[PDB]
Amino acid sequence: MTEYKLVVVGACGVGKSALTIQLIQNHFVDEYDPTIEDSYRKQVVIDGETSLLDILDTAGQEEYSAMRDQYMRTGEGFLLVFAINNTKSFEDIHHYREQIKRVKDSEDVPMVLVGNKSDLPSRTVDTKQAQDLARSYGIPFIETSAKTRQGVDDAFYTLVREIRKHKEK
Ligand SMILES: *C[C@H](F)C(=O)N1CCN(c2nc(OC[C@@H]3CCCN3C)nc3c2CCN(c2cccc4cccc(Cl)c24)C3)C[C@@H]1CC#N
Ligand SMILES: Nc1nc2c(ncn2[C@@H]2O[C@H](COP(=O)(O)OP(=O)(O)O)[C@@H](O)[C@H]2O)c(=O)[nH]1
Ligand SMILES: [Mg+2]
């Protein structure tokens, strides 16, 4: 049975954990320890294809040990998450993009740009600017709310499709 290793990255507080739990369990967790990094597994049906998602919810600390690279390098695809009400989280996307390129040693890594917290009326990041960034990278852009589940299937299933597309090549 097919296993896809997904990795969720992005600034503290963007909603990595809430997005992951929303995908795996179908509810919103508004308080999950910000330091806690863990893998979540779920059997899914995408485009009629049965598979196992193994999703790393990144946290811990910013460090570049051999061991941290090895672990991130096992990811087949990455969700680059920012929050639509946090400009800095949006600017930080380039950092994560660059680290993924470095550890996979490739310009062609399956990635999806995720603008989370789409339910909030305190937007600081233009959807236009977001789309232009995803376009500059050659990757899909999905607006999400972990709170309302808006876009959550779309974000994870899109990334699986990007991985399948990479695995065919
Ligand atoms: C809030 C909670 F602690 C959290 O989610 N964290 C802490 C930060 N951490 C992290 N942070 C950065 O950068 C943070 C800012 C942005 C620009 C540079 N700094 C100032 N970068 C990373 C990580 C986790 C470890 N990451 C890493 C390390 C080696 C290889 C590699 C390969 C691909 C992708 C990554 Cl993220 C890699 C770099 C983690 C987490 C925030 C997240 N995600
Ligand atoms: N309104 C709203 N709040 C969210 C959403 N996703 C996460 N949050 C909140 O944002 C904060 C950080 O979420 P968390 O999942 O811990 O972020 P992480 O550090 O990237 O794991 C918490 O207070 C969450 O309740 C969302 O889609 N909408
Ligand atoms: Mg978290």
Report the 10 Å Cβ neighbour count for 124.
13
14 C-alpha to center of ligand 2: Å? 6
Residues 77 and 169: their CA atoms lie apart, in Å, by 15
Tell me the ligand closest to 97's alpha carbon: 1
17 C-alpha to center of ligand 2: Å? 7
- Cα of 60 vs its chain's centroid, Å: 16
Q: At what angle do helices 66-73 and 93-104 cross, to 10 degrees?
A: 90
Which residues have CB atoms below 5 A from the ion given as ligand 3? 16-17, 59
Among protein residues, the one with the nearest Cα to ligand 2's atom 25 is 30
List the domain range (segments joined by +) for residue 169.
1-169
Catalogue the E-assigned strands of 23-158: 38-46, 49-57, 77-83, 111-116, 141-143
Nearest to 154 by CA among 138, 140, 168, 133: 140
Number of separate domains in the chain: 1
Token pair of 86, please?
A: 């946090």
CB 56 within 8 A of CB 96: no
Among protein residues, the one with the nearest Cα to ligand 1's atom 7 is 61
* Cited resolution, angstroms: 1.9
Method for structure elucidation: X-ray
Tell me the ligand closest to 77's alpha carbon: 1
What CATH number has the domain bearing residue 97? 3.40.50.300
121 C-alpha to center of ligand 3: Å? 22
81 C-alpha to center of ligand 3: Å? 11
- DSSP structure class, residue 43: E
Among protein residues, the one with the nearest Cα to ligand 2's atom 12 is 13
- Hey, is 31 helix, strand or coil? coil
Residues 131 and 128: their CA atoms lie apart, in Å, by 5
Residues 127 and 148: their CA atoms lie apart, in Å, by 18
Give ligand 2 pocket residues (Cβ under 6 A).
12-18, 30, 32, 34, 116-117, 119-120, 145-147
> Residue 19 contacts by C-beta under 8 Å, 6 or more apart in sequence?
8, 79, 81, 114, 116, 144, 146, 152, 155
